[PDB]
Design a protein around this ligand. Structure first.
Ligand SMILES: [Mg+2]
Ligand SMILES: [Mg+2]
Ligand SMILES: [Zn+2]
Ligand SMILES: [Zn+2]
Ligand SMILES: [Zn+2]
Lengths: 196, 133, 114, 49, 43, 165, 98, 85, 783, 267, 65
RNA sequence: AAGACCAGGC
């Protein structure tokens, strides 16, 4: 994420040959999507990333210090004399064709941060395995090669569905499933099954 | 086959309403009294001034897919400056005789008004529109 | 760790041959070719060439999933002119431009000082 | 850079967290609930230091 | 590390709402979402 | 308040009207008043409507008030779903809430009632009032881990008969 | 017209972790709360001496990068001198839909 | 005891989603296990797609027992239930 | 409640979700290492034994593979060890635990699972990368995005557990949903945003691209359609090529505002058989809206034919956008010099408005608004003069937005962004609030230590003069700060509160399922609704159809349904019917059109006393309008040549229909009397769409076509009857509990007046359900 | 100059080729730019065998580091790819081997360069595996640093690969590319507030075309023709060659397609 | 952390310039921008390669063992 | 094993 709470996985990765490219022949280390902007109302991010255009360029200081008198008009005025389109925009070219992009783009340098939670320490999957001793159920946790809780709230939406055969198995042969001997008179588990 | 309508209109309004290539156009026909035309022209192919003498025509051919023209032998029915392709989508009774038709060239609209498109404009999925001069 | 192989972007792993041609059963006389281990570098370029040939009614390529090397060409031409020959000429044409562009460039470069 | 302020308890660093609580020995008045025998209550939490 | 060394805790009127008086003494923005939001504070 | 009313000519007209709105409830006392239409008067307290105008008038008001939470909110649920709630809270007699003081105190299946709240005293007095259990509730059949009498498992399947071709 | 005191600099009301926000006053006010939880979730050099300590989990940035956009509060925070974050070049387009 | 006569049967004469779902499955069970097959398997070699083929032709030999809430019930064969749905 | 009802389970996965715009709707990008672990235990049959002996040899290492091979006298054979994983002499009768593989029944969940649509069958598409991919448009019902959530998948280990997975819960046959008798997946984000772009009147494409898009649609019959423009340079309209995604005989019509079949705004929507005639496509069409394209295409064509439709729309739109671009710059929140100027003087004027009322309240001339304080009426007077001021400023930026404005453009698609955003960001932020009141006096007699005491003015009390692009002041920031947390608080409190509400609902309805006599019951077999939903209908097959006889003058109704053969002036002109001239005069028939026209007053009477507000638009089964166009399109009817049905054909056949529309079948009067009742509404609509004057006059049906209209209806109706079994208990709870989660600002918008406040939202819902004998806002409304 | 696509060199250097590229199709100039980036092969270290690394950097850090170091690829043609060459693992026919030994002798920091890499494998007299030094002083790329008692002993084994493979291999850098500055073909629509002309900056290449002017009805027939580039070498291959081989690699793998039609044609 | 060989964004070798940079700032007293000029970084993704860089290695060496 | 606590993720 950037520094204005713009949480974002990664999704796919293109080599510089497919990526949109400016007329100068630059390439974004990162595409994110205009939809994560106007509902979230993070205007500093559209600032900082403009701001750091004039940082990279003039070798100058990124004074994003809060209650100063630094303005968007300001930044830009500097950028406009500094060689560019004052509001960010740069006519990028599509990668595959090199056909000019009908939109122009706000092209920014913007401190992003790489957070904990990489995909590969949570990619759990089980088909049976270890099993608690008390209740004969899937041990817990992703690092015990556990299994997922198919909690009651999950249950409801199988019943809603009317999926009966499933919800059964997915509660027996996917879990506890056991075999005891019952009394035909009293009905309890007394029966000393001296089997074989 | 074969034409279905012919008349020469005087353009009395060119509204570029918040569009950049396209345009709504208002016209009366030089000859015919109670006749009027409202149409969407692609101004960025064919510039439509005020008061031009646009000659309007509606064919219906000269069926399968499309082929790149192509004038290797091809000669489609045009001494025509400008040619679109439409669908009729509602036919309307504007009192007594005064009938009106509605055409779509993929969203480029066309409203037309008279009373003698009878033996001519039968409810079709055909129609090519042709302008000249 | 569920990352594919890096070179599978140009090595045809056994089985996979480079060109597979199959007959388009939608519209008469037209075919759909599959280029294992290729993309827009190559696709877009052939497709545009097929476009200067007046004998080709229809021509398009599409990268089905960008996970994968593959891309698909669909070619349609006029009765009498086999689809593959279109590829063959638009291919040879590419070469004859490229081949010429190179030597044009060189007599240029070979002028400059610095 | 490591600025201190923790402890080390079996080679595991430990930060004591500020605990927050209402001060003692200040006097305060509280209009008690609408269905109750008492109208207002004055309260002093008293402790020595 | 810097932030955890400047933490706060409050156990059990309107004790999560950022109160007028916090101005300059607690951070107006630092606090964890949900579970114990507004109670845990950073100076 | 705005209100649409049949015209003396056919269609519905906007006829506006003076409506009185209150802070507090005494029903059996303000409908008995002169000047006021005692046939349209309404109160958001569905507990009073229930007591004054009977259960059926209640069931209706409860709905109005449930639906009002939803449709004020921007949403729209289908009448069937809400009404189905509204009817359960009603077919008992008065107003059975959706808490352990409502549905759960009713005499459904011992096993199915226990899975909600107060798991122990529910099972206790069940051993005490020695209750036979249907095992027709979803929950019972879950516990025991057999297929519920639910959608897929509402019927049974058997063979023919005809046999062979 | 009857002052007694004066603030040092308004910026100071902010925490440690919200003082990395570059124009938090141009941002809407939850968000900053969010960043404030993620500043912490970051990777970078957490200590100029990791090659010597021996703890469960470390996570260090191959190339960390003091940002192009700073807050006077960062200096006393030691941020330009120990970042987590890199000045990634950034596109705001719908491209491939991914 | 007890049933309900083959005449005076109220229930939807159609076959419900929930009915067929279980029918197919129960067939798709016997099919997946090597029990014999009642249609010219036209290429199709999958138990469930086969059941769908036997279901379309009505050569599934099974009977729903629909229980009413009073306890008594009505029988319907898969040969005699309309499969519009 | 924790290990019996229910449990931790085997045969599952979790990972981070990721959006895949080249995946199928009902698919499930699954990582290969997962598919390397989970295992459907397959029996061995001569139909499989080849692709199965194959499937052993690959072992648990290569993808399409297998561990353990179960035999008779049940015995495991572990295929990563064992001196025999290479040999292996299979048999019909043995099981083989193959890897999960392409195109498989999985059950793909996401918490919190408050829905039948948080669960679904997806089809399995094995992929690279440790991640689950899914089509963007299965985003809505799951309520994912990819700030990196994380989702589950359970693998059925039986043949009918996978039948029951796919014949029942599969993503498509889930598109249109009981909850709101409308569909719960639409087009979203880029797709939804550029579909608007692509579709503008201004948008044209030329050959090259037109052929790749064409080719990019997978069910495209290889028929390049003729371009709208053939003149200089054959060009296509965006609208045009798009239609190649929309199937055959798909008819749909709208009219938004001032829409004239000449759409001088290019608004509304008219789709005439799988081709679009006018009107910028966006949310209201391809959204998950009510009368929209997916509602139609499903009901109409299939679920499959519709799920296929999902993909196509994207495949094209996405592509078009991949080569159009869309960005959003900070340049997108800059207004005119004039407009910033005038915006600020907007606040200035409304500033000295609040200032003058304050100055009045001070000379003790502020009059006591009846029923409120002196003070409290001042709170009203301001927050009103202050919102008033901010919205006006806000809608003054909205006027000033160019049409090429990235913000304004997503707002127009309806992809992200609404009015307040533009408002905020560019204009003024507005008044802040905690506890419904402006900012607390927190320090004794003022808000922040920086103003004098007793300061009632806006900037003291917590108005934010500024935009976000403007920047905010220190104090302004803090007050924002304060309204901030308040939200974050109750978002934590709401999702917990409503989370318990649902748990109770669900456990309070549970086994209320519809039994095989169409009566809603439970474990004791108590009756709850004698006929489910009051009408025996499933809520998916239902739609907002307009009751033609409620509105309009008696005069206007008259000339609409009246047929008087004995009046020369009110007969069916012999142009309409083929018998027409031979009909004029005639008692024997007039007695039928008479008692038809009486039956239709009994109707207008009966409805006007049910729906007492005139509201003529009610949810109802079997959309008749679609069957009519569908008839007059299938059968190609010319609107000059005379129909060919007797009055006896129509009248006597419409009364014939109504017999066959069975919900209940019992052969005794009691049952047949609720049968008469469950249908009463529907048949109103019937008689109002299928009346003599209408069938003849308006949509000119021929005998042959008519009998088809009559036929579909019967069959469509019968298909709409709720299925015995249906677990309507749970269905009903989650159908109420789910919106409850999505309830914003749990205060109100009644706080413009300082006590027009009425408890609404989640607090109310808590009372209602608890039967709260001491509510916060009791009130009489008196008439 | 002749038949097909024309080239004009505006500026040239060992680092940058500036050129117009006239009378070519769009689809081509691009497919060039693309191969240029990804597909013209080159040598770079692919395998490190570390013996001692008492350094303050991690092993596989420094591995990655030499990964990037630009090795001389002017004779890349006579080296086979390891994957092909019939030699178990590697030989002098398919791989260059390098050696890096350094040690802190100084109390002061002991810097470590690419000038420091020493070859070993038999070069069989060809141009291959000289770490390119564009530096003013004679030591480019600063690999790692050593304190005092610090030691690094390793054995890089450069092999032939391409950008698609890993970017350590692409010889290409930044490639400036542009078609038609005045937006005559209206392939883009300029965002604005006031006046697009005062609001965007006339391209560098504006002097190399005509005015819009002004005036005349948009030209619909006009196609994507003429392109402006300026290709920049990383060092391994000469600038001038990067195009040449780009143009060629394109031609070569279009030819492999043609050829591959001849085979499957058998039956 | 040691100056990167090659800019993440374009690929131009920037690693051989950390040397020549610190020198151009200290001995010639230039400012960051005009020193990035003289070093031949014009595409600013490469200007960002250097100006953002913190050379933490210098501290790690500081540790004796 | 497993209980307790704390951080934390949608
Ligand atoms: Mg979201
Ligand atoms: Mg999310
Ligand atoms: Zn016993
Ligand atoms: Zn070798
Ligand atoms: Zn760079």
């Amino acid at each position: 994420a950037s520094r204005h709470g713009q949480k974002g996985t990664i999704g796919i990765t293109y080599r510089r040959e497919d990526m949109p490219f400016t007329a100068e022949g630059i390439v974004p280390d990162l595409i994110i999507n205009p939809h994560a902007i106007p509902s979230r109302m993070t205007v500093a991010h559209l600032i900082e990333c403009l701001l750091s255009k004039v940082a990279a360029l003039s070798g100058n200081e990124g004074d994003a210090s809060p209650f100063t008198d630094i303005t968007v008009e300001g930044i830009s005025k500097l950028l406009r004399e500094h060689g560019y389109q004052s509001r960010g925009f740069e006519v990028m070219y599509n990668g595959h064709t090199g056909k000019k992009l009908m939109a122009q783009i706000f092209f920014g340098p913007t401190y992003y941060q790489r957070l904990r939670h990489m995909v590969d320490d949570k990619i759990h999957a089980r088909a049976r395995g270890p099993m608690q001793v008390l209740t004969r159920q899937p041990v817990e946790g992703r690092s015990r090669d556990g299994g997922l809780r198919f909690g009651e709230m999950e249950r409801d939406c199988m019943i809603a569905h009317g999926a009966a055969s499933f919800l059964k198995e997915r509660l027996m042969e996917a879990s506890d499933a056991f075999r005891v001997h019952i009394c035909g008179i009293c009905g309890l588990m007394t029966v000393i099954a001296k089997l074989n | 086959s074969n034409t279905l309508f012919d008349d020469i209109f005087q353009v009395s309004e060119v509204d570029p309403g918040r569009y950049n290539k396209v345009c709504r156009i208002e016209a009366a026909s030089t000859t015919q009294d109670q006749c009027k035309l409202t149409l969407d022209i692609n101004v960025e192919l064919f510039p439509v001034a005020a008061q031009d003498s646009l000659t309007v025509t509606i064919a219906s051919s000269l069926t399968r897919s499309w082929r790149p023209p192509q004038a290797g032998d091809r000669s489609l029915a045009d001494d025509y400056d400008y040619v679109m392709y439409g669908t009729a989508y509602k036919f309307e009774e504007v009192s007594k005789d005064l009938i009106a038709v509605y055409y779509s060239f993929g969203g480029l609209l066309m409203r037309l008004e008279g009373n003698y498109r009878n033996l001519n404009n039968l409810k079709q999925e055909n129609a090519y529109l042709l302008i000249r001069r | 760790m569920n990352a594919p192989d890096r070179f599978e972007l140009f090595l045809l792993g056994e089985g996979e041959s480079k060109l597979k041609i199959d007959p388009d059963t939608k519209a008469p006389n037209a075919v759909v070719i599959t280029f294992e281990k290729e993309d827009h570098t190559l696709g877009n370029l052939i497709r545009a060439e097929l476009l200067n040939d007046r004998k080709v009614l229809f021509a398009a390529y599409k990268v089905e999933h960008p996970f994968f090397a593959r891309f698909k060409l669909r070619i349609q031409t006029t009765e009498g002119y086999d689809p593959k020959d279109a590829l063959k000429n638009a291919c040879n044409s590419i070469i004859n431009k490229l081949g010429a562009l190179k030597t044009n460039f060189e007599t240029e470069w070979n002028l400059q000082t610095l | 850079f490591d600025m201190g302020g923790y402890f080390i308890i079996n080679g595991s660093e430990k930060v004591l967290i500020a605990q927050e609580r209402s001060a003692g020995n200040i006097v305060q008045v509280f209009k008690k609930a609408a269905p109750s025998p008492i109208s207002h209550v004055a309260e002093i939490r008293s402790a020595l230091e | 590390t810097l932030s955890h060394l400047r933490r706060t805790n409050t156990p059990i009127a309107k004790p999560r709402q950022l109160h007028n008086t916090h101005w300059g003494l607690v951070c107006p923005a630092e606090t964890p979402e949900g579970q114990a939001c507004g109670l845990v504070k950073n100076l | 308040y705005d209100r649409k009313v049949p015209s003396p000519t056919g269609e519905y007209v906007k006829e506006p009207e003076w409506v009185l709105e209150t802070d507090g409830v005494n029903l059996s006392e303000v409908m008995t008043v002169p000047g006021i239409d005692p046939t349209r008067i309404y109160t958001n307290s569905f507990i009073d409507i229930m007591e004054v105008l009977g259960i059926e008038a209640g069931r209706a008001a409860l709905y109005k008030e449930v639906y009002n939470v939803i449709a004020s909110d921007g949403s729209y649920v289908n009448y069937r779903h809400m009404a189905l709630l509204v009817d359960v809270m009603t077919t008992q007699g008065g107003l059975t809430s959706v808490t352990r003081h409502g549905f759960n105190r009713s005499n459904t299946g011992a096993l199915m009632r226990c899975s909600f709240e107060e798991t122990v005293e529910i099972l206790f007095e069940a051993g005490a009032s020695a209750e036979l259990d249907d095992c027709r509730g979803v929950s019972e059949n879950v516990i025991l881990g057999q297929m519920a009498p639910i959608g897929t498992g509402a019927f049974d399947v058997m063979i023919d008969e005809e046999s062979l071709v | 017209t009857t002052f007694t005191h004066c603030e040092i600099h308004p910026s100071m009301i902010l925490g440690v972790a919200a003082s990395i926000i570059p124009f938090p006053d141009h941002n809407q006010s939850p968000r900053n709360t969010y960043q404030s939880a993620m500043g912490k979730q970051a990777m970078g050099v957490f200590l100029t001496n990791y090659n010597v300590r021996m703890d469960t989990m470390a996570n260090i940035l191959y190339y960390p990068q003091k940002p192009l956009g700073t807050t006077r509060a960062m200096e006393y925070l030691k941020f330009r001198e120990l970042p987590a974050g890199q000045n990634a070049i950034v596109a705001i387009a719908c491209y491939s839909g991914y | 005891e007890k049933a309900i006569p083959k005449d005076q049967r109220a229930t939807t004469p159609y076959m419900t989603k929930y009915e067929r779902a279980r029918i197919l499955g129960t067939r798709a069970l016997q099919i997946s296990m090597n029990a014999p097959v009642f249609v010219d398997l036209e290429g199709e070699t999958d138990p469930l797609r086969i059941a769908m083929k036997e279901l379309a032709e009505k050569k599934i030999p099974l009977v729903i027992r629909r229980y009413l809430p009073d306890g008594s019930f009505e029988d319907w064969s898969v040969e005699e239930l309309i499969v519009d749905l | 409640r924790g290990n019996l009802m229910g449990k931790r389970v085997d045969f599952s996965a979790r990972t981070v979700i990721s959006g895949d715009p080249n995946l199928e709707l009902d698919q499930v990008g699954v990582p290969k290492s997962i598919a390397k672990t989970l295992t459907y235990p397959e029996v061995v049959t001569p139909y499989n034994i080849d692709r199965l002996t194959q499937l052993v040899r690959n072992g648990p290492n290569e993808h399409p593979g297998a561990k353990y091979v179960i035999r008779d006298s049940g015995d495991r054979i572990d295929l990563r060890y064992s001196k025999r994983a290479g040999d292996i002499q299979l048999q019909y009768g043995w099981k083989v635990e193959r890897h999960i593989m392409d195109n498989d029944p999985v059950l793909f969940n996401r918490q919190p699972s408050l829905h039948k649509m948080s669960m679904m069958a997806h089809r399995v598409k094995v992929i690279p990368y440790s991640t689950f991919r899914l089509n963007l448009s299965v985003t809505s019902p799951y309520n994912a995005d990819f700030d990196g959530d994380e989702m589950n998948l359970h693998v059925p280990q039986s043949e009918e557990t996978r039948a029951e997975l796919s014949q029942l819960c599969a993503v498509p046959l889930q598109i249109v949903s009981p909850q709101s008798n409308k569909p719960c997946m639409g087009i979203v984000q880029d797709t939804l945003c550029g579909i608007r772009k692509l579709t503008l009147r201004d948008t044209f494409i030329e050959l090259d691209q037109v052929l790749n898009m064409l080719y990019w649609v997978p069910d495209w019959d290889g028929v390049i359609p003729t371009p709208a423009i053939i003149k200089p340079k054959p060009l296509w309209s965006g609208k045009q090529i798009l239609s190649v995604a929309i199937p055959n005989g798909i008819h749909l019509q709208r009219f938004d505002e001032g829409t004239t079949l000449l759409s001088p705004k290019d608004n509304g929507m008219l789709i005439i058989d799988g081709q679009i005639i006018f009107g910028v496509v966006e949310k209201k069409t391809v959204g998950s809206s009510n009368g929209g394209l997916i509602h139609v295409v499903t009901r109409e064509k299939g679920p499959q034919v519709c799920a296929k439709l999902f993909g196509n729309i994207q495949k094209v739109v996405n592509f078009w956008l991949l080569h159009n671009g869309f960005s959003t710059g900070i340049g997108d929140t800059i207004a005119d010099g004039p407009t910033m100027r005038e915006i600020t003087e907007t606040i200035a004027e409304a500033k000295k408005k609040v200032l003058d009322v304050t100055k009045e309240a001070q000379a003790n001339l502020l009059t006591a608004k009846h029923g409120m304080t002196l003070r409290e009426s001042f709170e009203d007077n301001v927050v009103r003069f202050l919102n008033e001021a901010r919205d006006k400023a806000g809608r003054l930026a909205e006027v000033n937005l160019k049409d090429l404005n990235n913000v304004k453009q997503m707002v127009m698609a309806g992809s992200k962004g609404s009015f307040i955003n533009i408002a905020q960001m560019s204009a003024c932020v507005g008044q802040q609030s905690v506890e419904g009141k402006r900012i607390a006096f927190g320090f004794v007699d003022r808000t922040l230590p920086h103003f004098s005491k007793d300061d009632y003015s806006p900037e003291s009390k917590g108005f934010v003069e500024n935009s976000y692009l403007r920047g905010l002041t220190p104090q302004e920031f803090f007050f924002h700060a304060m309204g901030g947390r308040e939200g974050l608080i109750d978002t934590a409190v709401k999702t917990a509160e409503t989370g318990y509400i649902q748990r109770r609902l669900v456990k309070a309805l549970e086994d209320i399922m519809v039994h095989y006599d169409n009566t809603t019951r439970n474990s004791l077999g108590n009756v709850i609704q004698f006929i489910y939903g009051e009408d025996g209908m499933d809520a998916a097959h239902i739609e907002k159809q307009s009751l033609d006889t409620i509105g309009g003058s008696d005069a206007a109704f008259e000339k609409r349904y009246r047929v008087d053969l004995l009046n020369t002036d009110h007969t069916l002109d012999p142009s309409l019917l083929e018998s027409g001239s031979e009909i004029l005069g005639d008692l024997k028939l007039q007695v039928l059109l008479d008692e038809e026209y009486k039956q239709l007053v009994k109707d207008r009477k009966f409805l006007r006393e049910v729906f007492v507000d005139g509201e003529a638009n009610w949810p109802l089964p079997v959309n008749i309008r679609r069957i009519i166009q569908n008839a007059q399109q299938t059968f190609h009817i010319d609107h000059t040549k005379p129909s060919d049905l007797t009055i006896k054909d129509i009248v006597l056949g419409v009364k014939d229909l109504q017999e066959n529309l069975l919900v209940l079948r019992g052969k005794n009067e009691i049952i047949q009397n609720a049968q008469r009742d469950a249908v009463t509404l529907f048949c109103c609509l019937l008689r109002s769409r299928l009346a003599t004057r209408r069938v003849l006059q308006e949509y000119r049906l021929t005998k042959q076509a008519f009998d088809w209209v009559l036929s579909n209806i019967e069959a469509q109706f019968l298909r709409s009857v709720v299925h015995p079994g249906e677990m309507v208990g749970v269905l009903a709870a989650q159908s109420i509990g789910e919106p409850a989660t999505q309830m914003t600002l749990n205060t109100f918008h009644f706080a413009g007046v300082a006590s027009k406040k009425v408890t609404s939202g989640v607090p109310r819902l808590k009372e209602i359900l608890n039967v709260a004998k001491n509510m916060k806002t009791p009130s009489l409304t008196v008439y | 100059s002749e038949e097909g696509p024309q080239v004009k060199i505006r500026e040239a250097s060992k680092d940058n080729v500036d050129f117009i590229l006239s009378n070519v199709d769009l689809a081509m100039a691009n497919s060039l730019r693309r191969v240029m980036i990804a597909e013209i092969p080159t040598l770079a270290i692919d395998s490190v065998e570390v013996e001692t690394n008492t350094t303050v950097l991690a092993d596989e850090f420094i591995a990655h580091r030499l990964g990037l170091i630009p090795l001389q690829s002017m004779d890349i043609e006579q080296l086979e790819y390891s994957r092909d060459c019939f030699c178990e693992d590697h030989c002098d026919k398919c791989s260059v081997v390098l050696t890096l030994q350094a040690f802190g002798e100084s109390e002061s920091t002991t810097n470590v360069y690419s000038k420091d890499l020493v070859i070993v494998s038999n070069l069989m007299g060809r141009n291959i595996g000289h770490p390119i030094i564009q530096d003013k002083e004679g030591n480019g790329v600063l690999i790692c640093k050593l304190r005092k008692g610090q030691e690094l002993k390793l054995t890089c084994v450069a092999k032939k690969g391409i950008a698609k493979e890993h970017a350590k291999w692409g010889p290409a850098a930044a490639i400036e590319f542009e078609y038609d500055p005045w937006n005559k073909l209206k392939h883009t629509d300029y965002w604005y507030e006031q006046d697009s002309a005062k609001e965007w900056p006339q391209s560098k290449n504006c002097e190399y075309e005509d005015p819009p002017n002004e005036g005349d009805p948009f030209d619909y027939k006009a196609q994507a023709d003429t392109f402006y580039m300026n290709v920049e070498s990383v060092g391994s291959i000469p600038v001038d060659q990067v195009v040449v081989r780009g143009i060629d690699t394109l031609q070569k793998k279009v030819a492999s397609i043609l050829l591959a039609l001849t085979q499957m044609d058998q039956d | 952390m040691i100056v990167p060989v090659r800019c993440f964004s374009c690929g131009k070798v920037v690693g051989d310039k950390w040397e020549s940079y610190l020198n151009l700032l200290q001995e010639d007293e230039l400012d960051e921008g005009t020193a990035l000029s003289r070093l031949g970084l014009k595409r600013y993704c490469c200007r960002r390669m250097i100006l953002t860089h913190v050379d933490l290695i210098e501290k790690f060496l500081r540790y004796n063992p």
